[PDB]
Amino acid sequence: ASVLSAATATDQGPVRENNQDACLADGILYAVADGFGARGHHASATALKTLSAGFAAAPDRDGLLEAVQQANLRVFELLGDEPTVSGTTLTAVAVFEPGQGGPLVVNIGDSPLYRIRDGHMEQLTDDHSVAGELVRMGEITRHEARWHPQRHLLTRALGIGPHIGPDVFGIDCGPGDRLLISSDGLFAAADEALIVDAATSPDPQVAVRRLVEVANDAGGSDNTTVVVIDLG
């Protein structure tokens, strides 16, 4: 697997007063960060700026994991003394060559990574939210979790303490696969079938536009940000 094509889109949506999502798509590194709190936009932007500088200076598995740690520390040092809590999720994919261990995902919070293969979209990451933990534990299905009242309550977040333990795992993927990283806004309310239809648009630049349109037409209750990566 190498990168054939990639695209990104971010949209405030019609409801939220600002856009606190951020995204990154540079070389082999792709990421979404969904900020929260009064300065969530400062948190997501700061996390991705820190991730990208850290990875650029050490572009391997260890360098990536360390950049994630530095992003946590930088957002925390900047925002940690504010009267209220702001922080961010982070989901990052590094499309490493085989000599570097192949594609790797690092995730903290509820911004999912999906693999799209033969028209079928499968979530690869676990969601660190109250509902997401119930799914992980096998207590409820993803369908049953859809309208869980604590769906949006994070159980892990970047930038809120000196200590973060992200999930870090190798991606089962190869030539012809598509990866999608998104903030949770995409799945706020839209019909899953309409999402999959948009997510499978052959041109990734069309896919990201259609994904934002699907989320907004479904009500646009949240910011939506999407990164689409085609592998060859």
Instruction: Single out the residue of 11, 34, 127, 177 in contact with ligand CAC (rule: CB under 6 A).
Output: 34
- In the chain, alpha helices (H): 40-57, 61-79, 130-136, 142-145, 192-199, 204-217
Q: For ligand CAC, what does the binding mask look like between residues 54 and 93, x meaning CB under 6 A?
A: -----------------------------------x----
Taking CB within 5 to 8 Å according to partner kind, which of Mn ion, ligand CAC, none is near residue 89? Answer: ligand CAC
- Burial (CB count within 10 angstroms: exposed 0-12, middle 13-18, buried 19+), residue 83: exposed
Instruction: Single out the residue of 34, 127, 177, 230 in contact with Mn ion (rule: CB under 5 A).
Output: 34
Residue with tokens 């660190």, as numbered in its chain? 128
Considering only 5-13, 33-41, 114-122, 200-208, which stretch makes contact with ligand CAC by CB under 6 A? 33-41
Q: Interaction with Mn ion in 94-153: which residues (CB under 5 A)?
A: 152
CA-to-CA distance for 177 and 229, rounded, in angstroms?
8
CB 90 within 8 A of CB 108: yes
Instruction: Single out the residue of 12, 22, 23, 36 in contact with Mn ion (rule: CB under 5 A).
Output: 36
Q: Interaction with ligand CAC in 141-170: which residues (CB under 6 A)?
A: 152
Q: For ligand CAC, what does the binding mask look like between residues 98 and 117, x meaning CB under 6 A?
A: -----------xx-------
Question: Is 118 labeled as ligand-binding?
Answer: no
Residue of minimal CB distance from ligand CAC?
36
For 94, 101, 102, 173, 203, the CA distances from 61, given in Å and listed in that order, are: 8, 8, 10, 17, 29
For 119, 151, 175, 191, 211, the CA distances from 143, given in Å and listed in that order, are: 19, 12, 30, 12, 20
Residues near ligand CAC (CB under 6 A) = 20, 34, 36, 40, 89, 109-110, 152, 184, 222
